[PDB]
From a paper:
NADPH oxidases (NOX) are transmembrane proteins, widely spread in eukaryotes and prokaryotes, that produce reactive oxygen species (ROS). The cytosolic dehydrogenase (DH) domain belongs to the Ferredoxin NADP +Reductase (FNR) family which has motifs to bind a flavin cofactor and a pyridine dinucleotide NAD(P)H. Thus, the NOX core catalytic domain contains the necessary machinery to move electrons from the electron donor – NADPH – through the flavin and heme cofactors to the ultimate electron acceptor, molecular oxygen, to make the ROS product. SpNOX purifies as a monomer and is constitutively active, so it represents the minimal functional core shared by all NOX family members. Here, we obtained X-ray structures of WT and F397W mutant of DH-only, and of a F397W mutant of full-length SpNOX.
The use of the full-length SpNOX F397W construct resulted in about 20% of the crystals produced displaying diffraction limits close to 4 Å, with some crystals showing an anisotropic diffraction between 3 and 3.3 Å in a privileged direction of the crystals, as often observed for membrane proteins. The high-resolution model of the DH domain of SpNOX allowed resolution of the anisotropic crystals of full-length SpNOX-F397W to 3.6 Å. Like the previously reported structures of the NOX family, the crystallographic model of SpNOX harbors the N-terminal TM domain that encompasses 6 membrane-spanning alpha helices chelating two hemes, and the C-terminal cytosolic DH domain. The inner and outer heme are respectively coordinated by the imidazole rings of pairs of histidines H69 (TM3)/H129 (TM5) and H82 (TM3)/H142 (TM5), holding them perpendicular to the plane of the membrane. The metal-to-metal distance of the two hemes is ~21.5 Å, while the shortest interatomic distance is ~9.8 Å, between the vinyl groups. SpNOX has 9.2 Å edge-to-edge distance between the isoalloxazine ring to the inner heme; a conserved aromatic residue, Y136, at equal distance from both hemes (6.9 Å), or even F107 also on the pathway to the hemes, could assist the electron transfer between the hemes as previously suggested. We observed electronic density corresponding to the FAD cofactor at the interface of the DH and TM domain. FAD binding in the full-length construct preserves the π-stacking interaction with W397 and the interactions with F235 and P234 observed in the DH-only structure. In addition, the full-length SpNOX structure shows that the adenine extremity of FAD is packed in a pocket including the amino acid F399 from the DH domain– providing a potential role for this residue – as well as residues from the D-loop of the TM domain. Including SpNOX into this movement analysis is all the more interesting given that SpNOX is constitutively active. Here, Figure 8A shows that in our SpNOX structure, the relative position of TM vs DH domain is intermediate between the inactive (NOX2) and active (DUOX) structures.
Author numbering: 1 to 399
């Protein structure tokens, strides 16, 4: 039985931090039963927030990373409840107690926005969420103002505190004001803007520095221009080698609509880094491909780079009808030139969408899936129902 090995290194970071907190506290000084955990949980929280590649690897992918972000947050806040229970009276002297109180007021408010806020419009959510930071500062003041002596000691308590808080802080500071400016500097200019259905625009980009990524990965993209929000948004390559780069976009909501029908052909543009683990090249000798139409870009990227297949690949792409269908011709070029390639294309309009019950596909083959998350999750489960002896990876674009 072999559940989630690589993720586990990520997990250990959690476990370790916690147990290390706990033993430390009980053996030496368990003066406050709960808070130690709460705080280290927070430390972790920031650390995860970082979009740090090193721990990206450990926790595997963004999807996983952000998942754990939520996990820690949950734990933390419930524990703040119990700490607030340990207070007894909400206002207090207000000499210090109110600091703690005030922090949780804002924290609670915002974390409680998480559900409702993510419902509609995440731009606001960007800024609001960041207010969490301010509240964290207040939290630190609460404790430092109270337990000065012990923190400045040699006690493992004291170092543990120092380190875990500090990491958290450094991360915090960094993610609030730094990731955008140090990470986006990979530089870029746009090249060509090209129009496909209404769903879609594709863009070509040239770079002050020649770029690198593993085939199938993704990056976030930031722009300097006229009344165009620069904020980084997730994207999966449509082409890349050397100085040269291409991204493909479906019209989504407002920002994406903006680039669909507005983007001025000249702009100064910025790129954080490669991320994600849809590593085509690393996949098995046989690879099987599933694309929700709008979301076929990774596949495209690997087709455009390397004109000959690593090994034979079975590919399926679902697009409803020509009316939505994009890239048809470019795929078709590939097919003609590429004997090694097996290609299936679906107008879900007629007959409908694809189910794999009445399908057999070689177990000895990694399966790669990118689509609207609904379909992707469904698909996955039905393919599992086909065969656990098969190798399967599936992604849906969320956060
Ligand atoms: C790993 C990965 C890879 C890609 C993508 C996502 C992820 C997670 N996307 C999706 C891409 O983020 C999305 O299509 C646009 O950024 C939509 O931005 P709007 O401001 O229009 O979002 P708006 O809120 O108006 O609606 C679009 C949807 O995208 C979500 N979204 C997009 N960016 C977000 C962000 N930074 N924070 C939170 N939610 C965000 C919104 O939450 C919403 O559900 C993508 N798209 C694409 O066209 N081509 C691509 O190659 C990729 N690749
Ligand atoms: C259930 C609890 C939580 C939810 C639902 C939540 C939700 C989110 C969401 C949706 C984002 C946007 C994702 C991104 O693009 O970065 C985000 C970002 C972030 N969160 Fe959280 N979060 C939670 C807890 C926490 C905690 C506990 C911390 C810190 C201790 C934290 C710190 C951050 C930071 C620093 C960012 C990055 C902001 C930026 O620079 O863009 N979050 N959170
Ligand atoms: C409404 C929120 C909170 C209230 C009312 C509160 C109240 C208090 C009170 C009354 C004390 C003793 C000092 C005093 O009474 O002046 C205290 C100590 C402490 N609180 Fe809080 N608190 C809150 C939130 C938090 C949070 C969110 C954390 C950690 C994340 C935390 C961690 C601690 C720690 C660590 C101590 C002392 C332990 C030590 O320094 O070794 N508290 N709190």
């Amino acid at each position: 039985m072999e559940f989630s090995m690589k993720s586990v290194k990520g997990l250990l970071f959690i476990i370790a931090s916690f147990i290390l907190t706990l033993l430390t506290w009980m053996n030496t000084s368990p003066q406050f039963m709960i808070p130690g955990l709460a705080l280290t949980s927070l430390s972790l929280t920031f650390i995860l927030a970082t979009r740090l590649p090193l721990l990206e690897s450990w926790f595997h992918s963004l999807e996983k990373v952000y998942t754990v972000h939520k996990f820690t947050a949950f734990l933390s806040i419930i524990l703040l409840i119990f700490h607030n229970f340990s207070m007894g009276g909400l206002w207090g002297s207000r000499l210090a107690a109110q600091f703690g109180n005030l922090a949780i007021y804002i924290f609670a408010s915002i974390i409680l926005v998480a559900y409702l806020g993510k419902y509609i419009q995440y731009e606001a959510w960007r800024w609001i969420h960041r207010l969490v930071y301010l509240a964290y500062i207040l939290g630190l003041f609460h404790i430092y103002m109270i337990m000065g002596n012990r923190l400045l000691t040699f006690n493992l308590l004291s170092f543990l505190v120092g380190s875990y808080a500090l990491l958290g802080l450094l991360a915090g500071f960094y993610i609030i004001f730094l990731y955008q400016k140090i990470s986006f500097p990979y530089l870029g200019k746009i090249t060509h803007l090209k129009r496909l259905n209404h769903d879609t625009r594709e863009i070509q980009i040239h770079l002050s520095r020649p770029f690198n990524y593993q085939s199938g990965q993704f990056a976030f993209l930031k722009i300097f221009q006229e009344g165009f929000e620069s904020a980084p948004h997730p994207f999966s390559i449509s082409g890349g080698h050397g100085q040269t780069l291409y991204f493909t976009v479906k019209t989504s909501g407002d920002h994406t609509k903006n680039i669909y029908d507005n983007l001025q052909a000249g702009s100064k543009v910025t790129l954080d880094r490669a991320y994600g683990h849809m590593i085509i090249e690393e996949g098995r000798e046989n690879q099987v491909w599933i694309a929700g139409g709008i979301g076929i870009t990774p596949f495209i990227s690997y087709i455009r780079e390397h004109p000959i297949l690593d090994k034979q690949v079975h590919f399926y792409y679902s697009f409803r009808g020509d009316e939505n269908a994009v890239y048809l011709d470019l795929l078709r070029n590939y097919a003609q030139k590429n004997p090694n390639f097996e290609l299936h294309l679906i107008d879900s309009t007629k007959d409908g969408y694809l189910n794999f019950e009445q399908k057999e596909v070689p177990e000895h083959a990694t399966v790669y899936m990118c689509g609207p998350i609904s379909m992707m999750k469904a698909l996955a489960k039905q393919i599992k129902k086909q065969n656990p002896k098969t190798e399967l990876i599936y992604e849906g674009w969320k956060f």
